Amino acid sequence: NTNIAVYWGQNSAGTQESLATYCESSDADIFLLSFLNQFPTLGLNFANACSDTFSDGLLHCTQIAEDIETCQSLGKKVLLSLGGASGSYLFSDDSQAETFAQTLWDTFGEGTGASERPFDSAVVDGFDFDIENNNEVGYSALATKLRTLFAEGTKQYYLSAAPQCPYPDASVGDLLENADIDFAFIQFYNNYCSVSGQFNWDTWLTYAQTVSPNKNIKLFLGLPGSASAAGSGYISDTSLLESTIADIASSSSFGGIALWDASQAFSNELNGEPYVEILKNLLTS
Numbered sequence: 160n161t162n163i164a165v166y167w168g169q170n171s172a173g174t175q176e177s178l179a180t181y182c183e184s185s186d187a188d189i190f191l192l193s194f195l196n197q198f199p200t201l202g203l204n205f206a207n208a209c210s211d212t213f214s215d216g217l218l219h220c221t222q223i224a225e226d227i228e229t230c231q232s233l234g235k236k237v238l239l240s241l242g243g244a245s246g247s248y249l250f251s252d253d254s255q256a257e258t259f260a261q262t263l264w265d266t267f268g269e270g271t272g273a274s275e276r277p278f279d280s281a282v283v284d285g286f287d288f289d290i291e292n293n294n295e296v297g298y299s300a301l302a303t304k305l306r307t308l309f310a311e312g313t314k315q316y317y318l319s320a321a322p323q324c325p326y327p328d329a330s331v332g333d334l335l336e337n338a339d340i341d342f343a344f345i346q347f348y349n350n351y352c353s354v355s356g357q358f359n360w361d362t363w364l365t366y367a368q369t370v371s372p373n374k375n376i377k378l379f380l381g382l383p384g385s386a387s388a389a390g391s392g393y394i395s396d397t398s399l400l401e402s403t404i405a406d407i408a409s410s411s412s413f414g415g416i417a418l419w420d421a422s423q424a425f426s427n428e429l430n431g432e433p434y435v436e437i438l439k440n441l442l443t444s
């Protein structure tokens with residue numbers, strides 16, 4: 160199809176509402192929980208949306224857990240996003256990351272090993288790799304091991320990556336080249352290759368067609384939800400938005416639009432219509 164993905168958790172706009180609030184919009188389909196910012200030693204950060212912890216200090220988030228389940232009843236997909244700009248994360252090798260697949264499965268997925276579960280009995284629909292530290296070690300091996308474990312589950316799981324538009328990406332390039340990935344939420348902002356810059360969708364399309372181990376990987380046009388969601392690359396021209404979408408929706412590789420982040424895209428108005436709503440509507444046509 161064509162979906163809207165939104166990051167949620169880091170409260171970019173200040174006025175961030177509950178996960179479920181955004182799920183109860185018609186406006187977004189995929190929700191990326193931002194972030195598991197610390198690993199292999201587990202650490203979550205959802206700005207103001209979760210502050211309770213287990214005794215060991217790992218976040219414990221009952222409201223998000225309830226909201227994951229509400230979101231899923233409404234047909235939405237909820238992935239846990241790893242990493243972030245800033246944060247505290249690194250794999251020393253493939254074996255370490257393979258161990259970590261099991262940790263994720265037992266902590267967030269349908270794994271049976273009795274670890275502390277930040278989301279109680281709520282189960283994510285998969286993981287986003289928003290690696291922004293320019294270290295690529297382990298992610299490919301982690302994704303591949305996760306896939307083997309997913310077969311033990313009772314639903315489809317998704318893996319995504321959040322590269323910036325320069326190709327190849329210095330953090331998730333290896334992941335994208337050597338693992339089976341469902342969605343690429345490519346950040347077309349803070350970079351020369353934005354829509355208004357030297358837009359390089361064509362390179363990503365070559366990647367999807369010839370390089371991606373998953374040939375029906377879906378590429379997403381990743382955008383700021385407001386001017387001031389990022390330093391640069393935000394698009395307020397609905398004609399440019401229209402022509403862009405028309406250019407890129409031609410192929411089976413086009414998945415939709417990704418936005419940083421829900422707080423921003425839902426509160427940013429273009430004459431009283433939320434930005435996320437404008438974009439959802441541009442996609443449907």
Ligand SMILES: Cn1c(=O)c2[nH]c(Cl)nc2n(C)c1=O
Binds near residue numbers: 289321346389
């Ligand atoms: C802090 N930060 C992120 O962690 C992030 N991930 C993605 Cl995909 N976009 C962004 N932006 C724009 C950020 O500012």
